[PDB]
Design a protein around this ligand. Sequence first.
Ligand SMILES: O=P(O)(O)O[C@@H]1[C@@H](OP(=O)(O)O)[C@H](OP(=O)(O)O)[C@H](O)[C@H](OP(=O)(O)O)[C@H]1OP(=O)(O)O
Ligand SMILES: [Zn+2]
Length: 404
Amino acid sequence: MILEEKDASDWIYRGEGGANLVLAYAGSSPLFVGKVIRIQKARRNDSVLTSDEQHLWRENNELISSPNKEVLEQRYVQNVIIPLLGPKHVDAGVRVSVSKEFLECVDKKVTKQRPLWRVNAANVDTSHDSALILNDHSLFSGDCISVEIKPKCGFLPTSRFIGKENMLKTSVSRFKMHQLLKLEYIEISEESEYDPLDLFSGSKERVLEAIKALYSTPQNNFRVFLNGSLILGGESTGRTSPEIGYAFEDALKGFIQSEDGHRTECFLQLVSDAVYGSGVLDRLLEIQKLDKLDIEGAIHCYYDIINQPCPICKEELSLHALPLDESLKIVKEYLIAATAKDCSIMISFQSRSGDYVSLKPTNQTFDYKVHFIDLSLKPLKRMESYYKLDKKIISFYNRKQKAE
Ligand SMILES: O=P(O)(O)O[C@@H]1[C@@H](OP(=O)(O)O)[C@H](OP(=O)(O)O)[C@H](O)[C@H](OP(=O)(O)O)[C@H]1OP(=O)(O)O
Ligand SMILES: [Zn+2]
């Protein structure tokens, strides 16, 4: 009922996103076996919702009346996301109380396993009294190999609201553009080989092409687990070396019944057939496409919502003419889309339901489950920051192409 200082040694580091630090259970307790703990970070860059936020989520009252951030996230997933993606692939998590000492203790424990830049940006928020418990989907429900993909955005904007100068956002994906800016900022060592347009394309061959690329340059988009311990990918991690490639190949023996050296290609095909067969990407894409207008459109609607004069227009007379009702719907939908754009997918495998994949070369049958994880509510205030960042992306790409 309250996790204490002594309980902190039963949880081991699993990884983290921007918002959360995730630990896995390594103790004996039947309440916690096969679970992970999600803990919110105190951003040194940054009560539950702002005034303008409360007006935006007005429609869903259980949300606006959340005692704390944990409950907020749980309810966001439960009442907004689940109705849209379905309960089969989404899990909302359960509240648990935690002591300041537990948090303080956990934070100290995992410091030397965290990337230094992550430490530099944020620590655990020791002021929270709560945390979230979720099923660990790197366990199935024998051996279990599991694969985490963070697909990002898989479509091109179409909007009337993209500026004349910015038209390259129409041909070239956001992830591809951002890659270039990230490189410039020493955030990544080399450009990723991944193109989400392939992953979401609905073409089987392009799906396998995306998986091969994800294997190649995982960065923060690909991870593989054997029974919970990480065996590929990182934070963002560098290109897959022969060293990496061999360690992974070895870790796969037994699970993939193929000749030494041919296990990897089998595995990648296995992942591809699962993603594609499950059609789980199509439904995520429909939620992504709730960004109907692109940030270059939506931004105008935001300034109406907060009741400020629009700086983006200077000294369209079309979005500012919409009813306030409609303006909220649009911005609301923009923020949901942002959730779907930044979540990840976990596909769990175990040897053999109508849910399975066949390995043509080996004759094995693998069962699989797919779950959407890392689904965060996005603060409304970020609408201003989305526009700035988008602008920085596109201006830098145009500048790279200006150097023909
Ligand atoms: O903005 P993006 O698309 O770069 O995504 C951010 C992510 O950067 P990425 O490009 O995936 O490396 C970013 O991931 P990293 O911090 O790079 O691991 C976060 O996931 C961030 O969301 P939040 O702050 O955790 O709510 C993400 O921010 P939101 O855009 O989802 O607010
Ligand atoms: Zn405007």
